[PDB]
Short mmCIF file of all heavy atoms in Angstrom, two decimals:
data_model
loop_
_atom_site.label_atom_id
_atom_site.label_comp_id
_atom_site.label_asym_id
_atom_site.label_seq_id
_atom_site.Cartn_x
_atom_site.Cartn_y
_atom_site.Cartn_z
N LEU A 970 2.83 -35.79 -1.99
CA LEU A 970 3.02 -34.70 -2.93
C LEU A 970 4.50 -34.43 -3.16
O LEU A 970 4.91 -34.03 -4.25
CB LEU A 970 2.31 -33.45 -2.43
CG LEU A 970 2.04 -32.37 -3.47
CD1 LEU A 970 1.41 -32.98 -4.71
CD2 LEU A 970 1.13 -31.30 -2.89
N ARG A 971 5.33 -34.66 -2.14
CA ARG A 971 6.77 -34.50 -2.30
C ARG A 971 7.34 -35.57 -3.23
O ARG A 971 8.28 -35.30 -3.98
CB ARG A 971 7.46 -34.53 -0.94
CG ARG A 971 8.29 -33.30 -0.65
CD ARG A 971 8.94 -33.37 0.72
NE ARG A 971 7.99 -33.08 1.79
CZ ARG A 971 8.32 -32.99 3.07
NH1 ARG A 971 9.56 -33.16 3.48
NH2 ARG A 971 7.37 -32.72 3.96
N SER A 972 6.80 -36.78 -3.17
CA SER A 972 7.27 -37.84 -4.06
C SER A 972 7.01 -37.50 -5.52
O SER A 972 7.85 -37.74 -6.39
CB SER A 972 6.61 -39.17 -3.69
OG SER A 972 6.78 -39.46 -2.32
N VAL A 973 5.83 -36.94 -5.81
CA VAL A 973 5.51 -36.54 -7.17
C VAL A 973 6.45 -35.44 -7.63
O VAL A 973 6.93 -35.45 -8.77
CB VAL A 973 4.03 -36.11 -7.27
CG1 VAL A 973 3.66 -35.84 -8.72
CG2 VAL A 973 3.13 -37.17 -6.67
N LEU A 974 6.72 -34.46 -6.76
CA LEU A 974 7.63 -33.38 -7.11
C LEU A 974 9.05 -33.88 -7.30
O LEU A 974 9.76 -33.44 -8.21
CB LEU A 974 7.57 -32.28 -6.05
CG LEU A 974 6.33 -31.39 -6.10
CD1 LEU A 974 6.18 -30.60 -4.81
CD2 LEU A 974 6.41 -30.45 -7.29
N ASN A 975 9.49 -34.81 -6.44
CA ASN A 975 10.83 -35.37 -6.59
C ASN A 975 10.94 -36.21 -7.86
O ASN A 975 11.96 -36.16 -8.55
CB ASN A 975 11.19 -36.21 -5.37
CG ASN A 975 11.62 -35.36 -4.19
OD1 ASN A 975 11.64 -34.13 -4.27
ND2 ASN A 975 11.98 -36.01 -3.09
N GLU A 976 9.90 -36.98 -8.18
CA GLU A 976 9.93 -37.82 -9.37
C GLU A 976 10.00 -36.98 -10.63
O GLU A 976 10.71 -37.32 -11.59
CB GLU A 976 8.72 -38.74 -9.40
CG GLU A 976 8.64 -39.65 -10.62
CD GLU A 976 9.49 -40.89 -10.49
OE1 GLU A 976 10.15 -41.05 -9.44
OE2 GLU A 976 9.50 -41.70 -11.43
N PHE A 977 9.27 -35.86 -10.66
CA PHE A 977 9.27 -35.00 -11.84
C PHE A 977 10.65 -34.43 -12.11
O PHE A 977 11.08 -34.35 -13.27
CB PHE A 977 8.24 -33.88 -11.67
CG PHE A 977 8.19 -32.93 -12.83
CD1 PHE A 977 7.49 -33.25 -13.98
CD2 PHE A 977 8.85 -31.71 -12.78
CE1 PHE A 977 7.44 -32.38 -15.04
CE2 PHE A 977 8.81 -30.84 -13.84
CZ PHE A 977 8.11 -31.18 -14.98
N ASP A 978 11.36 -34.02 -11.06
CA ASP A 978 12.70 -33.48 -11.25
C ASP A 978 13.68 -34.56 -11.68
O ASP A 978 14.64 -34.28 -12.41
CB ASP A 978 13.18 -32.80 -9.96
CG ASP A 978 12.37 -31.56 -9.63
OD1 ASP A 978 11.46 -31.21 -10.41
OD2 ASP A 978 12.65 -30.93 -8.59
N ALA A 979 13.46 -35.80 -11.25
CA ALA A 979 14.33 -36.90 -11.67
C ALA A 979 14.20 -37.15 -13.17
O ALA A 979 15.19 -37.49 -13.83
CB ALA A 979 13.99 -38.16 -10.89
N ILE A 980 12.99 -37.00 -13.72
CA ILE A 980 12.80 -37.16 -15.16
C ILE A 980 13.55 -36.08 -15.92
O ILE A 980 14.18 -36.35 -16.95
CB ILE A 980 11.30 -37.16 -15.50
CG1 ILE A 980 10.58 -38.27 -14.73
CG2 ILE A 980 11.10 -37.34 -16.99
CD1 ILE A 980 9.11 -38.37 -15.06
N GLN A 981 13.49 -34.84 -15.44
CA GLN A 981 14.14 -33.74 -16.13
C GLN A 981 15.65 -33.93 -16.17
O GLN A 981 16.29 -33.63 -17.19
CB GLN A 981 13.78 -32.41 -15.46
CG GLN A 981 12.30 -32.08 -15.49
CD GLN A 981 11.73 -32.12 -16.89
OE1 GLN A 981 12.19 -31.41 -17.78
NE2 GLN A 981 10.71 -32.95 -17.09
N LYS A 982 16.24 -34.41 -15.08
CA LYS A 982 17.68 -34.64 -15.06
C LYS A 982 18.09 -35.74 -16.04
O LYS A 982 19.09 -35.60 -16.75
CB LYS A 982 18.13 -35.00 -13.64
CG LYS A 982 19.51 -35.64 -13.57
CD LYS A 982 19.96 -35.84 -12.14
CE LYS A 982 19.97 -34.52 -11.39
NZ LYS A 982 20.99 -33.59 -11.94
N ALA A 983 17.32 -36.83 -16.10
CA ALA A 983 17.65 -37.92 -17.01
C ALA A 983 17.53 -37.48 -18.46
O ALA A 983 18.21 -38.02 -19.34
CB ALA A 983 16.75 -39.12 -16.73
N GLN A 984 16.66 -36.51 -18.73
CA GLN A 984 16.51 -36.00 -20.09
C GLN A 984 17.78 -35.30 -20.56
O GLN A 984 18.20 -35.46 -21.72
CB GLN A 984 15.32 -35.05 -20.16
CG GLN A 984 14.83 -34.77 -21.56
CD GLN A 984 13.43 -34.19 -21.57
OE1 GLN A 984 12.87 -33.92 -22.63
NE2 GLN A 984 12.86 -34.01 -20.39
N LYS A 985 18.42 -34.52 -19.68
CA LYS A 985 19.66 -33.85 -20.05
C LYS A 985 20.78 -34.85 -20.31
O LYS A 985 21.58 -34.67 -21.23
CB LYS A 985 20.06 -32.86 -18.95
CG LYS A 985 19.09 -31.71 -18.78
CD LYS A 985 19.75 -30.53 -18.11
CE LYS A 985 18.83 -29.89 -17.09
NZ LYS A 985 17.42 -29.92 -17.54
N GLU A 986 20.85 -35.91 -19.50
CA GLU A 986 21.90 -36.90 -19.67
C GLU A 986 21.68 -37.74 -20.92
O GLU A 986 22.64 -38.13 -21.60
CB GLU A 986 21.99 -37.80 -18.44
CG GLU A 986 22.29 -37.05 -17.16
CD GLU A 986 22.29 -37.97 -15.95
OE1 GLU A 986 22.10 -39.19 -16.13
OE2 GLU A 986 22.49 -37.47 -14.82
N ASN A 987 20.42 -38.05 -21.24
CA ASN A 987 20.14 -38.90 -22.39
C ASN A 987 20.40 -38.17 -23.70
O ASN A 987 20.61 -38.82 -24.73
CB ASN A 987 18.69 -39.39 -22.33
CG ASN A 987 18.46 -40.61 -23.20
OD1 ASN A 987 18.43 -40.52 -24.43
ND2 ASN A 987 18.29 -41.76 -22.57
N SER A 988 20.40 -36.84 -23.69
CA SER A 988 20.61 -36.09 -24.93
C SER A 988 22.04 -36.22 -25.42
O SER A 988 22.32 -35.99 -26.61
CB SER A 988 20.23 -34.63 -24.73
OG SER A 988 21.14 -33.99 -23.85
N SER A 989 22.97 -36.56 -24.53
CA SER A 989 24.37 -36.64 -24.92
C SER A 989 24.66 -37.85 -25.80
O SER A 989 25.61 -37.82 -26.59
CB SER A 989 25.26 -36.67 -23.68
OG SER A 989 25.03 -35.53 -22.86
N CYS A 990 23.86 -38.90 -25.69
CA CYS A 990 24.13 -40.13 -26.43
C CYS A 990 24.04 -39.89 -27.93
O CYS A 990 23.23 -39.10 -28.40
CB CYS A 990 23.14 -41.22 -26.01
SG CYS A 990 23.30 -41.75 -24.29
N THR A 991 24.89 -40.59 -28.68
CA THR A 991 25.01 -40.39 -30.12
C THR A 991 24.73 -41.67 -30.91
O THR A 991 25.24 -41.83 -32.02
CB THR A 991 26.40 -39.87 -30.47
OG1 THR A 991 27.40 -40.79 -30.02
CG2 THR A 991 26.64 -38.51 -29.82
N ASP A 992 23.92 -42.57 -30.36
CA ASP A 992 23.53 -43.79 -31.05
C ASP A 992 22.01 -43.87 -31.06
O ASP A 992 21.36 -43.44 -30.11
CB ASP A 992 24.15 -45.02 -30.37
CG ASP A 992 23.40 -46.32 -30.66
OD1 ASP A 992 22.70 -46.43 -31.69
OD2 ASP A 992 23.58 -47.28 -29.87
N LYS A 993 21.46 -44.40 -32.15
CA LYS A 993 20.01 -44.43 -32.31
C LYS A 993 19.35 -45.33 -31.27
O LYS A 993 18.30 -44.98 -30.71
CB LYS A 993 19.64 -44.90 -33.72
CG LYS A 993 19.73 -43.81 -34.78
CD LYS A 993 19.82 -44.41 -36.17
CE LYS A 993 19.20 -43.49 -37.21
NZ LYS A 993 17.72 -43.48 -37.13
N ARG A 994 19.94 -46.50 -31.01
CA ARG A 994 19.26 -47.50 -30.20
C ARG A 994 19.13 -47.06 -28.75
O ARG A 994 18.05 -47.13 -28.16
CB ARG A 994 19.99 -48.84 -30.29
CG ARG A 994 20.35 -49.24 -31.71
CD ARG A 994 20.10 -50.71 -31.92
NE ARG A 994 18.70 -51.06 -31.71
CZ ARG A 994 17.70 -50.71 -32.51
NH1 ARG A 994 17.92 -50.03 -33.63
NH2 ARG A 994 16.46 -51.07 -32.20
N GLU A 995 20.23 -46.60 -28.14
CA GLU A 995 20.17 -46.20 -26.74
C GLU A 995 19.36 -44.92 -26.57
O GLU A 995 18.73 -44.71 -25.53
CB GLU A 995 21.57 -46.03 -26.17
CG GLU A 995 22.56 -45.35 -27.09
CD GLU A 995 23.90 -45.12 -26.43
OE1 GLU A 995 23.93 -44.94 -25.20
OE2 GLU A 995 24.93 -45.11 -27.14
N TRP A 996 19.37 -44.05 -27.58
CA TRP A 996 18.58 -42.83 -27.50
C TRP A 996 17.09 -43.13 -27.50
O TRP A 996 16.35 -42.66 -26.63
CB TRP A 996 18.94 -41.89 -28.66
CG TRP A 996 18.33 -40.54 -28.53
CD1 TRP A 996 18.66 -39.57 -27.63
CD2 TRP A 996 17.29 -39.99 -29.35
NE1 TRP A 996 17.88 -38.46 -27.82
CE2 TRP A 996 17.03 -38.69 -28.87
CE3 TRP A 996 16.55 -40.47 -30.43
CZ2 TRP A 996 16.07 -37.87 -29.44
CZ3 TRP A 996 15.59 -39.66 -30.99
CH2 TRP A 996 15.36 -38.37 -30.50
N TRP A 997 16.63 -43.94 -28.46
CA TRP A 997 15.20 -44.20 -28.57
C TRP A 997 14.70 -45.05 -27.40
O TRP A 997 13.61 -44.80 -26.87
CB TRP A 997 14.87 -44.89 -29.89
CG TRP A 997 13.41 -44.89 -30.18
CD1 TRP A 997 12.61 -45.98 -30.33
CD2 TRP A 997 12.56 -43.75 -30.33
NE1 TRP A 997 11.31 -45.59 -30.58
CE2 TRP A 997 11.26 -44.22 -30.58
CE3 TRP A 997 12.77 -42.37 -30.28
CZ2 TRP A 997 10.18 -43.37 -30.78
CZ3 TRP A 997 11.70 -41.52 -30.47
CH2 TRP A 997 10.42 -42.02 -30.72
N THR A 998 15.47 -46.05 -26.99
CA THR A 998 15.06 -46.90 -25.88
C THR A 998 14.95 -46.09 -24.59
O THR A 998 13.99 -46.25 -23.82
CB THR A 998 16.04 -48.06 -25.70
OG1 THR A 998 16.24 -48.71 -26.95
CG2 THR A 998 15.49 -49.06 -24.70
N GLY A 999 15.91 -45.20 -24.35
CA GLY A 999 15.86 -44.37 -23.16
C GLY A 999 14.71 -43.38 -23.19
O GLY A 999 14.07 -43.13 -22.16
N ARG A 1000 14.43 -42.81 -24.36
CA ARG A 1000 13.35 -41.83 -24.46
C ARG A 1000 11.99 -42.48 -24.24
O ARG A 1000 11.09 -41.87 -23.65
CB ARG A 1000 13.40 -41.13 -25.82
CG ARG A 1000 14.60 -40.22 -26.01
CD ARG A 1000 14.47 -38.93 -25.23
NE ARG A 1000 13.55 -38.00 -25.87
CZ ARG A 1000 13.35 -36.75 -25.48
NH1 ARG A 1000 14.01 -36.24 -24.45
NH2 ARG A 1000 12.48 -35.99 -26.13
N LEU A 1001 11.81 -43.72 -24.72
CA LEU A 1001 10.54 -44.40 -24.54
C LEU A 1001 10.26 -44.68 -23.06
O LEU A 1001 9.11 -44.58 -22.61
CB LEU A 1001 10.52 -45.71 -25.33
CG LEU A 1001 10.36 -45.60 -26.85
CD1 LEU A 1001 10.56 -46.95 -27.50
CD2 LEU A 1001 9.00 -45.03 -27.20
N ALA A 1002 11.29 -45.05 -22.30
CA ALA A 1002 11.11 -45.31 -20.88
C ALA A 1002 10.68 -44.05 -20.13
O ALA A 1002 9.85 -44.12 -19.22
CB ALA A 1002 12.39 -45.89 -20.28
N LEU A 1003 11.25 -42.91 -20.50
CA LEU A 1003 10.87 -41.65 -19.85
C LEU A 1003 9.41 -41.32 -20.10
O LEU A 1003 8.73 -40.77 -19.23
CB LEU A 1003 11.77 -40.52 -20.33
CG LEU A 1003 13.22 -40.54 -19.83
CD1 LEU A 1003 13.93 -39.25 -20.19
CD2 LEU A 1003 13.26 -40.77 -18.33
N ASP A 1004 8.90 -41.66 -21.29
CA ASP A 1004 7.49 -41.40 -21.60
C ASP A 1004 6.58 -42.20 -20.68
O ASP A 1004 5.54 -41.69 -20.23
CB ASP A 1004 7.22 -41.74 -23.06
CG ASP A 1004 5.79 -41.42 -23.48
OD1 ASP A 1004 4.88 -42.19 -23.12
OD2 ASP A 1004 5.59 -40.40 -24.17
N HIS A 1005 6.93 -43.45 -20.39
CA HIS A 1005 6.09 -44.27 -19.53
C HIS A 1005 6.07 -43.74 -18.10
O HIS A 1005 5.03 -43.80 -17.43
CB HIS A 1005 6.57 -45.72 -19.56
CG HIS A 1005 5.61 -46.68 -18.92
ND1 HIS A 1005 4.46 -47.11 -19.55
CD2 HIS A 1005 5.63 -47.30 -17.72
CE1 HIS A 1005 3.82 -47.95 -18.76
NE2 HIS A 1005 4.51 -48.08 -17.64
N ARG A 1006 7.21 -43.24 -17.62
CA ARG A 1006 7.25 -42.68 -16.27
C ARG A 1006 6.38 -41.43 -16.16
O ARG A 1006 5.77 -41.19 -15.11
CB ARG A 1006 8.70 -42.37 -15.89
CG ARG A 1006 9.56 -43.60 -15.69
CD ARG A 1006 11.04 -43.25 -15.57
NE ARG A 1006 11.33 -42.42 -14.41
CZ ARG A 1006 12.53 -41.94 -14.12
NH1 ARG A 1006 13.58 -42.19 -14.89
NH2 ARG A 1006 12.69 -41.19 -13.03
N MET A 1007 6.32 -40.63 -17.22
CA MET A 1007 5.46 -39.44 -17.19
C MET A 1007 3.99 -39.82 -17.20
O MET A 1007 3.17 -39.14 -16.57
CB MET A 1007 5.80 -38.53 -18.36
CG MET A 1007 5.33 -37.09 -18.17
SD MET A 1007 6.29 -36.20 -16.93
CE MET A 1007 7.24 -35.10 -17.97
N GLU A 1008 3.63 -40.89 -17.91
CA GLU A 1008 2.25 -41.35 -17.92
C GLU A 1008 1.79 -41.78 -16.53
O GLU A 1008 0.68 -41.47 -16.11
CB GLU A 1008 2.09 -42.49 -18.92
CG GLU A 1008 0.69 -43.07 -18.98
CD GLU A 1008 0.53 -44.07 -20.09
OE1 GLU A 1008 1.50 -44.29 -20.83
OE2 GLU A 1008 -0.57 -44.65 -20.22
N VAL A 1009 2.66 -42.50 -15.81
CA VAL A 1009 2.32 -42.95 -14.46
C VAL A 1009 2.16 -41.75 -13.53
O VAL A 1009 1.29 -41.75 -12.65
CB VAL A 1009 3.38 -43.93 -13.95
CG1 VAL A 1009 3.09 -44.35 -12.52
CG2 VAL A 1009 3.45 -45.15 -14.85
N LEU A 1010 2.98 -40.72 -13.71
CA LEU A 1010 2.92 -39.55 -12.84
C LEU A 1010 1.62 -38.78 -13.03
O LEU A 1010 1.00 -38.34 -12.05
CB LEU A 1010 4.13 -38.65 -13.09
CG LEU A 1010 4.33 -37.44 -12.18
CD1 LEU A 1010 5.80 -37.30 -11.83
CD2 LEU A 1010 3.84 -36.17 -12.85
N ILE A 1011 1.19 -38.60 -14.28
CA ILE A 1011 -0.04 -37.85 -14.55
C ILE A 1011 -1.25 -38.58 -13.98
O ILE A 1011 -2.13 -37.96 -13.38
CB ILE A 1011 -0.19 -37.59 -16.06
CG1 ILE A 1011 0.93 -36.67 -16.56
CG2 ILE A 1011 -1.54 -36.98 -16.37
CD1 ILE A 1011 0.77 -36.25 -17.99
N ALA A 1012 -1.31 -39.90 -14.16
CA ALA A 1012 -2.41 -40.66 -13.59
C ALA A 1012 -2.36 -40.67 -12.07
O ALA A 1012 -3.39 -40.80 -11.40
CB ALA A 1012 -2.39 -42.09 -14.14
N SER A 1013 -1.16 -40.53 -11.50
CA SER A 1013 -1.03 -40.48 -10.05
C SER A 1013 -1.66 -39.22 -9.47
O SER A 1013 -2.17 -39.23 -8.35
CB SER A 1013 0.44 -40.57 -9.64
OG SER A 1013 1.01 -41.80 -10.05
N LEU A 1014 -1.62 -38.11 -10.23
CA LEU A 1014 -2.21 -36.87 -9.75
C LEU A 1014 -3.71 -37.00 -9.53
O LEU A 1014 -4.24 -36.53 -8.52
CB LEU A 1014 -1.92 -35.74 -10.74
CG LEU A 1014 -0.48 -35.24 -10.87
CD1 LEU A 1014 -0.38 -34.22 -11.99
CD2 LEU A 1014 0.00 -34.64 -9.56
N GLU A 1015 -4.40 -37.65 -10.46
CA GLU A 1015 -5.85 -37.73 -10.37
C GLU A 1015 -6.30 -38.72 -9.30
O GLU A 1015 -7.24 -38.45 -8.56
CB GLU A 1015 -6.44 -38.12 -11.73
CG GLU A 1015 -7.94 -37.95 -11.83
CD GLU A 1015 -8.44 -38.01 -13.25
OE1 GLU A 1015 -8.04 -37.14 -14.05
OE2 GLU A 1015 -9.23 -38.92 -13.57
N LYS A 1016 -5.62 -39.87 -9.21
CA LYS A 1016 -6.09 -40.92 -8.32
C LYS A 1016 -5.63 -40.70 -6.88
O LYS A 1016 -6.43 -40.80 -5.95
CB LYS A 1016 -5.61 -42.28 -8.83
CG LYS A 1016 -6.41 -42.82 -10.00
CD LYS A 1016 -5.77 -44.06 -10.62
CE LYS A 1016 -4.98 -44.88 -9.61
NZ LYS A 1016 -5.83 -45.43 -8.52
N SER A 1017 -4.35 -40.40 -6.69
CA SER A 1017 -3.80 -40.35 -5.34
C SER A 1017 -3.92 -38.98 -4.68
O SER A 1017 -4.23 -38.90 -3.49
CB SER A 1017 -2.33 -40.78 -5.36
OG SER A 1017 -2.20 -42.12 -5.81
N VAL A 1018 -3.68 -37.90 -5.43
CA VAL A 1018 -3.66 -36.57 -4.83
C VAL A 1018 -5.06 -36.00 -4.74
O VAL A 1018 -5.57 -35.73 -3.65
CB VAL A 1018 -2.72 -35.64 -5.61
CG1 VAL A 1018 -2.70 -34.26 -4.97
CG2 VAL A 1018 -1.33 -36.22 -5.68
N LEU A 1019 -5.70 -35.80 -5.90
CA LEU A 1019 -7.01 -35.16 -5.90
C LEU A 1019 -8.10 -36.09 -5.38
O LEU A 1019 -9.00 -35.65 -4.66
CB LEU A 1019 -7.35 -34.67 -7.31
CG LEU A 1019 -6.66 -33.38 -7.75
CD1 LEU A 1019 -7.10 -33.00 -9.15
CD2 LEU A 1019 -6.95 -32.26 -6.78
N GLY A 1020 -8.02 -37.37 -5.72
CA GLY A 1020 -9.00 -38.32 -5.22
C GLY A 1020 -10.39 -37.98 -5.70
O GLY A 1020 -10.65 -37.84 -6.90
N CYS A 1021 -11.32 -37.85 -4.75
CA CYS A 1021 -12.71 -37.55 -5.05
C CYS A 1021 -12.96 -36.07 -5.29
O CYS A 1021 -14.01 -35.71 -5.83
CB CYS A 1021 -13.61 -38.04 -3.92
SG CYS A 1021 -13.00 -37.63 -2.27
N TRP A 1022 -12.02 -35.20 -4.91
CA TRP A 1022 -12.20 -33.76 -5.00
C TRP A 1022 -11.86 -33.20 -6.38
O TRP A 1022 -11.74 -31.98 -6.52
CB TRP A 1022 -11.36 -33.07 -3.93
CG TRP A 1022 -11.67 -33.56 -2.55
CD1 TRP A 1022 -10.87 -34.32 -1.75
CD2 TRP A 1022 -12.87 -33.33 -1.82
NE1 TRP A 1022 -11.51 -34.57 -0.56
CE2 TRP A 1022 -12.74 -33.97 -0.58
CE3 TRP A 1022 -14.05 -32.63 -2.08
CZ2 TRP A 1022 -13.74 -33.95 0.39
CZ3 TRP A 1022 -15.04 -32.61 -1.13
CH2 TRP A 1022 -14.88 -33.26 0.09
N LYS A 1023 -11.71 -34.06 -7.38
CA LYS A 1023 -11.57 -33.58 -8.75
C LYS A 1023 -12.86 -32.96 -9.28
O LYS A 1023 -12.81 -32.19 -10.25
CB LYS A 1023 -11.14 -34.72 -9.67
CG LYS A 1023 -12.02 -35.95 -9.56
CD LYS A 1023 -11.56 -37.05 -10.49
CE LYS A 1023 -12.47 -38.25 -10.41
NZ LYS A 1023 -12.04 -39.34 -11.33
N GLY A 1024 -14.00 -33.27 -8.66
CA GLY A 1024 -15.26 -32.70 -9.10
C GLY A 1024 -15.32 -31.19 -8.93
O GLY A 1024 -16.01 -30.51 -9.70
#
Side-chain angles (χ1 to χ4, degrees):
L970 198 49
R971 237 179 283 185
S972 307
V973 187
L974 284 165
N975 282 1
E976 179 82 0
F977 179 81
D978 293 359
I980 302 182
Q981 298 306 302
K982 163 174 303 294
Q984 196 163 181
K985 295 202 221 323
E986 301 177 2
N987 199 288
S988 68
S989 303
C990 295
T991 59
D992 158 24
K993 279 161 151 286
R994 313 222 60 71
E995 41 176 330
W996 189 70
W997 193 241
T998 309
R1000 292 285 284 187
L1001 286 172
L1003 288 189
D1004 183 284
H1005 191 77
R1006 291 169 62 183
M1007 200 71 108
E1008 178 173 358
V1009 177
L1010 186 138
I1011 294 186
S1013 298
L1014 290 174
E1015 192 166 298
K1016 282 171 30 63
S1017 298
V1018 180
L1019 282 181
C1021 45
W1022 304 110
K1023 52 180 182 179

